[PDB]
Amino acid sequence: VPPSGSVIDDYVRNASYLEERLIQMEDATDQIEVQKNDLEQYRFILQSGD
Amino acid sequence: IRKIAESLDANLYDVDSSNEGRSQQLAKVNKNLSDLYTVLKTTSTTLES
Amino acid sequence: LLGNALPTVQSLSERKYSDEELRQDISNLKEILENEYQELTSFDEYSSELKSGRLEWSPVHKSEKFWRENAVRLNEKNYELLKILTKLLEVSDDPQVLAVAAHDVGEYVRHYPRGKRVIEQLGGKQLVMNHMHHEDQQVRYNALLAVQKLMVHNWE
């Protein structure tokens, strides 16, 4: 087991960074897809103009 | 009709009575969906990367 | 700027020491390190930095807790200075400059909800789409962040 420096806190830091980095980036698809679906539904609705 | 529709499984919208007005509505609502089409691809490209 | 010792102060404060001297010394270092600048006004300094044409990162740039009442007075000139900054960005090629502006563009919605209409009247959405594929990784990453939060919060 080669000695490992005190960069354990650096690991803590970058993990605590990546957590929100990925949370904020992932929590968007759930919305962006439903907005797409709603707009597309509105489009077919309007397709019956006659 | 409006306040009975929601009680059951329903969705509400609004549409212009005129015809070319509906055409313009279609054009304006169609303009702003390519961005929506692309954004998911972008975020995925970031995610898997 | 170049130090970023903020992580270090807590790291060494928590760890083990038998001496009676450095314990309070590190606390003094931390309190004089953060209070000096992190506890400062922004809008005046924001204007000073933008008019100079020099844009960089600073605790003001990313800090948000002290950004609960800046937006209201960012509208004094109808965002004239900030829209001009966006224009210079459109005529700028420095990746750091590209990213810093979009950061606060996003901060707009993150703090101020009703400023969406002025953003719409900016017309830079297509330029954000163009920025999506610009060569630098940071610029397109931050642009995707900004546009994504804009679109999602636009309904929010």
Side-chain angles (χ1 to χ4, degrees), chain C residues 102-152:
Chain C
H103 289 117
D104 295 341
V105 178
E107 294 176 4
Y108 292 166
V109 298
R110 283 281 294 99
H111 283 289
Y112 201 59
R114 65 90 162 168
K116 62 185 183 294
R117 284 192 178 179
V118 298
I119 297 169
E120 280 292 29
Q121 284 103 30
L122 294 174
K125 177 181 260 170
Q126 302 81 13
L127 301 183
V128 173
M129 183 278 288
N130 307 135
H131 280 117
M132 295 298 102
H133 296 282
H134 268 70
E135 304 190 0
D136 176 14
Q137 181 266 349
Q138 289 305 330
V139 298
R140 56 198 158 196
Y141 178 81
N142 304 132
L144 174 60
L145 294 183
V147 70
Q148 163 251 319
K149 63 170 70 70
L150 174 77
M151 294 298 102
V152 168

Coordinates of all heavy atoms in Angstrom, one line a residue, chain C residues 102-152:
Chain C
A102 N -22.4 34.8 -19.9 CA -23.5 33.8 -19.8 C -23.8 33.3 -18.4 O -24.9 33.0 -18.0 CB -23.2 32.6 -20.7
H103 N -22.7 33.3 -17.5 CA -22.9 32.9 -16.1 C -24.0 33.8 -15.5 O -24.9 33.4 -14.9 CB -21.6 33.0 -15.4 CG -20.7 31.9 -15.7 ND1 -19.4 32.1 -16.3 CD2 -20.8 30.5 -15.6 CE1 -18.8 31.0 -16.5 NE2 -19.6 30.0 -16.1
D104 N -23.8 35.2 -15.6 CA -24.7 36.1 -15.0 C -26.0 36.2 -15.7 O -27.1 36.4 -15.2 CB -24.1 37.5 -14.9 CG -22.9 37.5 -14.0 OD1 -22.7 36.6 -13.1 OD2 -22.0 38.4 -14.1
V105 N -26.0 35.9 -17.1 CA -27.3 35.7 -17.8 C -28.1 34.7 -17.1 O -29.3 34.9 -16.9 CB -27.0 35.4 -19.3 CG1 -28.3 35.2 -20.0 CG2 -26.2 36.5 -19.9
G106 N -27.5 33.5 -16.8 CA -28.2 32.5 -16.1 C -28.6 32.9 -14.6 O -29.7 32.7 -14.2
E107 N -27.7 33.6 -14.0 CA -28.0 34.2 -12.6 C -29.3 35.0 -12.7 O -30.0 35.1 -11.7 CB -26.8 35.0 -12.1 CG -25.6 34.1 -11.8 CD -24.4 35.0 -11.4 OE1 -24.6 36.2 -11.2 OE2 -23.3 34.4 -11.2
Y108 N -29.5 35.7 -13.8 CA -30.7 36.5 -13.9 C -32.0 35.7 -13.5 O -32.7 36.0 -12.6 CB -30.9 37.0 -15.3 CG -29.9 38.0 -15.8 CD1 -29.7 38.3 -17.1 CD2 -29.1 38.7 -14.8 CE1 -28.8 39.3 -17.5 CE2 -28.1 39.6 -15.2 CZ -28.0 39.9 -16.6 OH -27.1 40.8 -17.0
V109 N -32.2 34.6 -14.2 CA -33.4 33.7 -13.9 C -33.2 33.0 -12.6 O -34.2 32.9 -11.9 CB -33.6 32.7 -15.1 CG1 -33.9 33.4 -16.4 CG2 -32.4 31.8 -15.2
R110 N -32.0 32.6 -12.2 CA -31.7 32.0 -11.0 C -32.2 32.8 -9.8 O -32.7 32.3 -8.8 CB -30.3 31.6 -10.8 CG -29.8 30.4 -11.6 CD -30.2 29.1 -10.9 NE -29.5 28.9 -9.6 CZ -30.1 29.2 -8.5 NH1 -31.3 29.7 -8.3 NH2 -29.3 28.9 -7.4
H111 N -32.1 34.1 -9.9 CA -32.6 35.1 -8.9 C -33.8 35.8 -9.3 O -34.8 35.7 -8.6 CB -31.5 36.1 -8.6 CG -30.3 35.6 -7.7 ND1 -30.5 35.2 -6.4 CD2 -29.1 35.3 -8.0 CE1 -29.4 34.8 -5.9 NE2 -28.5 34.8 -6.9
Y112 N -33.8 36.4 -10.4 CA -34.9 37.3 -10.8 C -35.8 36.6 -11.8 O -35.4 36.2 -12.9 CB -34.3 38.6 -11.5 CG -35.3 39.8 -11.5 CD1 -35.8 40.3 -10.3 CD2 -35.6 40.4 -12.7 CE1 -36.6 41.3 -10.3 CE2 -36.5 41.5 -12.7 CZ -37.0 41.9 -11.5 OH -37.8 43.0 -11.5
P113 N -37.1 36.4 -11.5 CA -38.0 35.6 -12.4 C -38.6 36.4 -13.6 O -38.7 35.8 -14.6 CB -39.1 35.2 -11.4 CG -39.2 36.4 -10.5 CD -37.9 36.9 -10.3
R114 N -38.9 37.7 -13.4 CA -39.6 38.4 -14.4 C -38.8 39.0 -15.5 O -39.3 39.6 -16.5 CB -40.5 39.5 -13.8 CG -39.7 40.6 -13.1 CD -39.4 41.7 -14.1 NE -39.0 43.0 -13.5 CZ -38.5 44.0 -14.1 NH1 -38.2 44.0 -15.4 NH2 -38.2 45.1 -13.4
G115 N -37.4 38.8 -15.5 CA -36.6 39.4 -16.5 C -36.5 38.5 -17.7 O -35.7 38.8 -18.6
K116 N -37.4 37.5 -17.8 CA -37.4 36.7 -19.0 C -37.7 37.5 -20.3 O -37.2 37.2 -21.4 CB -38.4 35.5 -18.8 CG -39.8 36.0 -18.6 CD -40.7 34.8 -18.3 CE -42.2 35.2 -18.2 NZ -42.4 36.1 -17.0
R117 N -38.7 38.4 -20.2 CA -39.1 39.2 -21.4 C -37.9 39.9 -22.0 O -37.8 39.9 -23.2 CB -40.3 40.1 -21.0 CG -41.6 39.4 -20.8 CD -42.7 40.3 -20.8 NE -44.0 39.7 -20.7 CZ -45.2 40.3 -20.6 NH1 -45.3 41.6 -20.6 NH2 -46.3 39.5 -20.5
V118 N -37.2 40.6 -21.2 CA -36.0 41.4 -21.7 C -35.0 40.4 -22.4 O -34.5 40.7 -23.4 CB -35.4 42.3 -20.6 CG1 -36.4 43.3 -20.1 CG2 -34.8 41.4 -19.5
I119 N -34.8 39.3 -21.7 CA -33.9 38.3 -22.3 C -34.4 37.9 -23.7 O -33.7 37.8 -24.7 CB -33.8 37.0 -21.4 CG1 -33.1 37.4 -20.1 CG2 -33.0 35.9 -22.1 CD1 -33.2 36.3 -19.0
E120 N -35.8 37.7 -23.8 CA -36.3 37.4 -25.1 C -36.1 38.5 -26.1 O -35.7 38.2 -27.3 CB -37.8 37.1 -24.9 CG -38.2 35.7 -24.4 CD -37.9 34.6 -25.4 OE1 -37.0 34.7 -26.2 OE2 -38.6 33.6 -25.3
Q121 N -36.3 39.7 -25.7 CA -36.1 40.8 -26.6 C -34.6 41.0 -27.0 O -34.3 41.8 -27.9 CB -36.6 42.1 -26.0 CG -38.2 42.2 -26.1 CD -38.9 42.0 -24.8 OE1 -38.3 42.2 -23.7 NE2 -40.1 41.5 -24.9
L122 N -33.7 40.4 -26.2 CA -32.3 40.4 -26.6 C -32.1 39.8 -28.0 O -31.3 40.4 -28.8 CB -31.4 39.7 -25.5 CG -31.4 40.4 -24.1 CD1 -30.6 39.5 -23.2 CD2 -30.8 41.8 -24.2
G123 N -32.7 38.7 -28.2 CA -32.5 38.0 -29.5 C -31.3 37.1 -29.6 O -30.9 36.7 -30.7
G124 N -30.5 37.0 -28.5 CA -29.3 36.2 -28.5 C -29.5 34.7 -28.5 O -28.5 33.9 -28.5
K125 N -30.7 34.2 -28.4 CA -31.0 32.8 -28.3 C -30.3 32.0 -29.5 O -29.7 31.0 -29.3 CB -32.5 32.5 -28.3 CG -32.9 31.0 -28.3 CD -34.4 30.9 -28.2 CE -34.9 30.6 -26.8 NZ -36.4 30.7 -26.7
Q126 N -30.5 32.6 -30.7 CA -29.9 31.9 -31.9 C -28.3 32.0 -31.7 O -27.7 31.0 -32.1 CB -30.3 32.6 -33.2 CG -31.8 32.6 -33.4 CD -32.5 33.7 -32.6 OE1 -31.9 34.6 -32.1 NE2 -33.9 33.6 -32.5
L127 N -27.8 33.1 -31.2 CA -26.4 33.1 -31.0 C -25.9 32.1 -29.9 O -24.8 31.6 -30.0 CB -25.9 34.5 -30.6 CG -26.3 35.6 -31.7 CD1 -25.8 37.0 -31.3 CD2 -25.7 35.2 -33.0
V128 N -26.8 31.9 -28.9 CA -26.5 30.8 -28.0 C -26.4 29.4 -28.7 O -25.6 28.6 -28.4 CB -27.5 30.8 -26.8 CG1 -27.3 29.6 -25.9 CG2 -27.4 32.1 -26.0
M129 N -27.4 29.2 -29.5 CA -27.4 28.0 -30.3 C -26.1 27.9 -31.1 O -25.5 26.8 -31.2 CB -28.6 27.9 -31.3 CG -28.7 26.7 -32.1 SD -27.7 26.6 -33.6 CE -28.6 27.8 -34.6
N130 N -25.7 29.0 -31.7 CA -24.4 28.9 -32.4 C -23.2 28.6 -31.5 O -22.3 27.9 -31.8 CB -24.2 30.3 -33.2 CG -25.4 30.7 -34.0 OD1 -25.8 31.8 -34.0 ND2 -25.9 29.7 -34.8
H131 N -23.2 29.2 -30.3 CA -22.2 29.0 -29.3 C -22.2 27.5 -28.9 O -21.2 27.1 -28.3 CB -22.4 29.9 -28.1 CG -21.9 31.3 -28.3 ND1 -22.7 32.4 -28.3 CD2 -20.6 31.8 -28.6 CE1 -22.0 33.5 -28.5 NE2 -20.7 33.1 -28.7
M132 N -23.3 26.8 -29.1 CA -23.3 25.4 -28.7 C -22.1 24.6 -29.3 O -21.6 23.8 -28.6 CB -24.6 24.8 -29.2 CG -25.9 25.3 -28.5 SD -25.9 25.0 -26.8 CE -25.5 26.6 -26.2
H133 N -21.7 24.9 -30.5 CA -20.7 24.1 -31.2 C -19.4 24.8 -31.3 O -18.5 24.4 -32.1 CB -21.2 23.7 -32.6 CG -22.4 22.9 -32.6 ND1 -22.4 21.5 -32.3 CD2 -23.8 23.1 -32.8 CE1 -23.6 21.0 -32.4 NE2 -24.4 21.9 -32.6
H134 N -19.2 25.9 -30.6 CA -17.9 26.6 -30.6 C -16.8 25.7 -30.1 O -17.0 24.8 -29.2 CB -17.9 27.9 -29.9 CG -18.3 29.1 -30.8 ND1 -19.5 29.2 -31.4 CD2 -17.6 30.1 -31.3 CE1 -19.6 30.3 -32.1 NE2 -18.4 30.9 -32.1
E135 N -15.5 25.9 -30.5 CA -14.5 25.0 -30.3 C -14.2 24.7 -28.9 O -14.0 23.5 -28.5 CB -13.2 25.5 -31.0 CG -13.4 25.8 -32.5 CD -12.1 26.0 -33.2 OE1 -11.0 25.9 -32.6 OE2 -12.2 26.3 -34.5
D136 N -14.1 25.7 -28.0 CA -13.7 25.5 -26.7 C -14.8 24.6 -25.9 O -16.0 24.7 -26.2 CB -13.6 26.8 -25.9 CG -13.3 26.6 -24.4 OD1 -12.9 25.5 -24.0 OD2 -13.4 27.6 -23.7
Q137 N -14.3 23.8 -25.0 CA -15.2 22.9 -24.3 C -15.9 23.8 -23.2 O -17.2 23.6 -23.1 CB -14.4 21.8 -23.5 CG -15.3 20.9 -22.7 CD -15.3 21.3 -21.2 OE1 -14.6 22.2 -20.8 NE2 -16.3 20.7 -20.5
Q138 N -15.2 24.7 -22.6 CA -15.9 25.5 -21.5 C -17.0 26.3 -22.0 O -18.1 26.4 -21.4 CB -14.8 26.3 -20.8 CG -13.8 25.6 -19.9 CD -14.5 24.7 -18.9 OE1 -15.6 25.0 -18.4 NE2 -13.9 23.6 -18.5
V139 N -16.8 27.0 -23.2 CA -17.8 27.9 -23.7 C -19.1 27.2 -24.0 O -20.1 27.6 -23.6 CB -17.2 28.7 -24.9 CG1 -16.0 29.5 -24.6 CG2 -16.9 27.7 -26.1
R140 N -19.0 26.1 -24.7 CA -20.2 25.4 -25.1 C -20.8 24.7 -23.9 O -22.1 24.6 -23.8 CB -19.9 24.4 -26.2 CG -18.8 23.3 -25.9 CD -18.4 22.7 -27.2 NE -17.0 22.1 -27.0 CZ -16.3 21.7 -28.1 NH1 -16.7 21.9 -29.3 NH2 -15.1 21.2 -27.8
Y141 N -20.0 24.2 -22.9 CA -20.6 23.7 -21.7 C -21.4 24.7 -21.0 O -22.6 24.4 -20.6 CB -19.5 23.1 -20.8 CG -20.0 22.5 -19.5 CD1 -20.5 21.3 -19.4 CD2 -19.9 23.3 -18.3 CE1 -20.9 20.7 -18.2 CE2 -20.3 22.8 -17.1 CZ -20.9 21.5 -17.1 OH -21.3 21.0 -15.9
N142 N -20.8 25.9 -20.7 CA -21.5 26.9 -20.0 C -22.7 27.4 -20.8 O -23.8 27.8 -20.2 CB -20.6 28.0 -19.6 CG -19.4 27.5 -18.9 OD1 -18.2 27.9 -19.2 ND2 -19.6 26.7 -17.8
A143 N -22.6 27.5 -22.1 CA -23.7 27.9 -22.9 C -24.9 26.9 -22.8 O -26.0 27.3 -22.7 CB -23.3 28.1 -24.4
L144 N -24.6 25.6 -22.8 CA -25.6 24.6 -22.6 C -26.2 24.8 -21.3 O -27.5 24.7 -21.1 CB -25.1 23.2 -22.8 CG -26.0 22.1 -22.5 CD1 -27.3 22.2 -23.4 CD2 -25.4 20.7 -22.6
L145 N -25.4 25.0 -20.2 CA -26.0 25.3 -18.9 C -27.0 26.4 -19.0 O -28.1 26.3 -18.5 CB -24.9 25.6 -17.9 CG -23.9 24.5 -17.6 CD1 -22.9 25.0 -16.5 CD2 -24.6 23.2 -17.1
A146 N -26.6 27.5 -19.5 CA -27.4 28.7 -19.5 C -28.7 28.5 -20.3 O -29.8 28.8 -19.8 CB -26.6 29.9 -20.1
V147 N -28.6 28.0 -21.5 CA -29.8 27.8 -22.4 C -30.7 26.8 -21.7 O -31.9 26.9 -21.8 CB -29.4 27.4 -23.8 CG1 -28.8 26.0 -23.8 CG2 -30.5 27.5 -24.7
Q148 N -30.2 25.7 -21.1 CA -31.0 24.7 -20.5 C -31.8 25.3 -19.3 O -33.0 25.1 -19.2 CB -30.1 23.5 -20.0 CG -30.8 22.6 -19.0 CD -30.2 22.8 -17.6 OE1 -28.9 22.9 -17.5 NE2 -31.0 22.7 -16.6
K149 N -31.1 26.0 -18.4 CA -31.8 26.7 -17.3 C -32.8 27.7 -17.8 O -33.8 27.8 -17.2 CB -30.8 27.3 -16.3 CG -29.9 28.4 -16.9 CD -29.1 29.1 -15.8 CE -28.0 28.2 -15.2 NZ -26.9 28.0 -16.2
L150 N -32.4 28.4 -18.8 CA -33.4 29.4 -19.4 C -34.6 28.7 -19.9 O -35.7 29.0 -19.4 CB -32.7 30.1 -20.6 CG -33.6 31.1 -21.4 CD1 -33.8 32.4 -20.6 CD2 -32.9 31.3 -22.7
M151 N -34.5 27.7 -20.7 CA -35.7 27.0 -21.2 C -36.5 26.3 -20.1 O -37.7 26.5 -20.1 CB -35.3 26.0 -22.3 CG -34.6 26.5 -23.5 SD -35.7 27.6 -24.4 CE -35.1 29.2 -23.9
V152 N -35.9 25.6 -19.2 CA -36.6 24.9 -18.2 C -37.3 25.9 -17.3 O -38.5 25.8 -17.0 CB -35.7 24.0 -17.4 CG1 -36.4 23.5 -16.1 CG2 -35.2 22.8 -18.3

